[PDB]
Write a protein that binds this DNA or RNA. Structure first.
Ligand SMILES: *OP(=O)(O)OC[C@H]1O[C@@H](n2cnc3c(N)ncnc32)[C@H](O)[C@@H]1O
Ligand SMILES: [Cl-]
Ligand code: NA
Length: 644
DNA sequence: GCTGATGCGTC
DNA sequence: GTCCGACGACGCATCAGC
């Protein structure tokens, strides 16, 4: 029999044979080390096509040898516990994980924390650290389905003392780990596999696997490589077609618990016949590409007529009305938000004509002040409870701004152009001020009308504009293009938006792609009255890899053992390295917000809270400035008042 | 019963 | 352009520690 040790499993080898090259036997549970070895081969390469090939080899072996393990292997590859709408959560972050690592090795938690920060990867700590769990019975090798089941066991532990019970399971995994298993167990619990391969590449690998090695054959499979009889050109075309069948099905039913059973019993070619868009099952939403100006919009939408719509500052609400009366509401990430919006559920009868029997709406839920009849900031919206049984205790009302209709009266509109979907939205749904209204829109290609419309959207409490084609490539087919829309935010344009010069007072050690480097920095404004620097926000995006390496080498020279007495951070995360205040950086943000932690400008707007920056990003170093020329706290308060 | 640290999801 | 993973503020919900 095939007695290959999984430590030598090589799913990246040439001429991979699903049966003979697997490190397990027919009917045997897929070993977790097989998955870990696949992860190693994937993280070693940078070309997605190579990663997809390697994963597909693993999946073809699972299909051929252990079909029941396909679903857990996929979820482990995605680092997910299940369908997003089920709401499974590990309840385990770096905190609980590092505590588990410490106990499993007898080390002090702070020593474990320090090492993980230096290496920028908890997996390398769990890998290299030495276990202290002296067991008198060598544990059996971990299996993929067993590890996945233990992860779901962790997620189900709730209530007081549950943290210790979660840690006991985690420790049980580590003691059974061999070779590279501990590294990826810890990374999975940390939420940072660092594969370079995610949903789109996992789907590509899955469609390729079940296409090359069809499921459901008598063992041993007579057809183990269905591409051997095709030319390279025909093989590529065939695999891309099969890949699109799976992609467009998944974007309408992003639920592996539903797809994989059908895939194993009926095959991929027949997948659309057994899995289709239906109210009650969330679908992948259409996303938007950032655009830096009106001119770039025209260039992208040359010839194609398009519409402009207010980009409201709320939360996406995918509203499902099932045939029968049941209503469900999903987030942009397919999370179930139904229990969050009892006021919307009781509102659905008002928004539709008697002929509407089912639908899927794409809306933005925006906080709404019914007394003033005005949109309220996104920050107010986030104060709503996550579960509210009684709509009578809601304190922050919401107004739905609908902008798309994806499903209507039992028929999918995914293949209809926006012009038609928008017309069906207007013809079948009813507006009520402050409760359910159509997104404010403008149909034009005049640059001056758009710039004016953009200016009004901001005055009307919006982030800018969304731009969408009406008839050319204007469908709702996410598998063809997920970012089919354009977003034109104020803070994208040149010379527009809040720009601040802030002092770098601390650095945080980078993780993953930032390991061995500084991944983030602590910034401060200058409080002129007290001659102190006040932390305002952290910063971790906007610089190239080259800039980020120069910052590391230059700021290293400013590392202090202890903070300066005139630097105030209060509730901010203590930096891994305090920095002698010197470097001044130009930073752009979308908005200023009242912060629960940052002291910057405390007392100039509110007695207790300071001010922070929404979506800050690095622009450039101000080498012509010292800390005393940084943006002052008083200026921060002025910007905040001018904003509100 | 209270508070602050942790987890996770929203943008 | 796609895909991916670095990184942000802040809120509710949860739970350990007191
Ligand atoms: O910045 P981003 O890419 O998340 O923006 C997209 C999101 O913007 C919200 N939104 C608000 N108003 C609209 C309209 N009218 N059309 C499309 N999207 C809109 C959504 O929440 C969206 O995901
Ligand atoms: Cl400069
Ligand atoms: Na959510």
């Amino acid at each position: 029999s095939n007695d290959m040790d999984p430590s030598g499993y090589n799913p990246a080898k040439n001429n991979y044979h699903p049966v003979e090259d697997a490190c397990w036997k027919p009917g045997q549970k897929v070993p977790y080390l097989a998955v870990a070895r696949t992860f190693e081969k994937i993280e070693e390469v940078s070309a997605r096509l190579r990663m997809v090939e390697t994963l597909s080899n693993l999946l073809r072996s699972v299909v051929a040898l252990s079909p029941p393990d396909l679903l857990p292997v996929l979820y482990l590859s995605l680092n997910h516990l299940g369908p997003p709408q089920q709401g499974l959560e590990l309840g385990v972050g770096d905190g609980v994980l590092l505590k588990a690592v410490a106990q499993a090795t007898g080390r002090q938690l702070e020593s474990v924390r320090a090492e993980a920060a230096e290496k920028g990867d908890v997996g390398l700590v769990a890998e290299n650290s030495r276990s202290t769990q002296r067991l008198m019975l060598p544990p059996p090798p971990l299996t993929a389905s067993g590890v996945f089941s233990k992860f779901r066991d962790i997620a189900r532990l709730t209530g007081s003392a549950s943290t210790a019970k979660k840690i006991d399971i985690i420790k049980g995994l580590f003691v059974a780990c061999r070779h590279s298993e501990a590294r990826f167990i810890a990374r999975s619990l940390s939420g940072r596999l660092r594969l370079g391969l995610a949903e789109q590449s996992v789907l590509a690998a899955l469609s390729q696997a079940v296409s090359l090695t069809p499921p459901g054959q008598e063992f041993p499979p007579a057809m183990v490589d269905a591409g051997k009889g095709k030319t390279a050109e025909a093989r590529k075309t065939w695999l891309e077609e099969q890949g699109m069948i799976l992609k467009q099905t998944f974007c309408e039913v992003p639920d592996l618990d539903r797809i994989i059973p059908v895939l194993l019993e009926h095959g991929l070619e027949r997948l659309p016949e057994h899995c289709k868009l239906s109210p009650g099952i969330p679908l992948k939403p259409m996303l938007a590409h950032p655009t830096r100006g009106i001119s770039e919009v025209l260039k992208r939408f040359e010839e194609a007529a398009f519409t402009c719509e207010y980009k409201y500052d709320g939360q996406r609400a995918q509203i499902h009305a099932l045939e029968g009366g049941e209503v469900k509401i999903f987030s942009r990430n397919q999370e179930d938000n139904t229990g969050k919006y009892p006021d919307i559920i009781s509102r659905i009868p008002k928004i539709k004509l008697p002929s509407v029997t089912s639908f899927i709406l794409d809306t933005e839920a925006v906080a709404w002040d019914r007394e003033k009849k005005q949109i309220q900031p996104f920050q107010v919206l986030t104060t709503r409870k996550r579960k509210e049984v009684d709509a009578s205790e809601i304190q922050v009302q919401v107004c739905l701004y609908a902008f798309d209709l994806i499903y209507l009266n039992g028929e999918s509109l995914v293949r209809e152009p926006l012009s038609r979907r928008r017309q069906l939205l207007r013809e079948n749904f009813v507006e009520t001020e402050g409760e359910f209204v159509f997104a404010t829109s403008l149909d034009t290609k005049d640059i001056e009308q758009i710039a004016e419309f953009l200016e009004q959207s901001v005055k009307d409490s919006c982030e800018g504009l969304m731009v969408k084609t009406l008839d050319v490539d204007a469908t709702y087919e996410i598998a063809k293009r997920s970012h089919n829309w354009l977003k034109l935010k104020k803070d994208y344009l040149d010379g527009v938006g809040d720009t601040l010069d802030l002092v770098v007072i601390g650095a945080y050690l980078g993780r993953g792609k930032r390991a061995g480097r500084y991944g983030g920095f602590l910034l401060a404004s200058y409080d002129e009255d007290s001659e102190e620097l006040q932390a305002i926000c952290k910063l971790g995006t906007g610089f190239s890899d080259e800039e980020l390496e120069e910052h590391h080498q230059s700021l290293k020279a400013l590392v202090l053992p202890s903070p300066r007495p005139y630097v105030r951070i209060d509730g901010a995360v203590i930096p891994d390295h305090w920095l002698d205040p010197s470097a001044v950086w130009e930073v752009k943000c979308a908005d200023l917000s009242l912060s629960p932690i940052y002291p910057a400008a405390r007392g100039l707007v509110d007695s207790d809270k300071g001010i922070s920056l929404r979506a800050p990003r690095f622009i450039r170093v101000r080498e012509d400035k010292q800390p005393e020329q940084a943006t002052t706290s008083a200026q921060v308060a002025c910007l905040y008042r001018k904003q509100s």
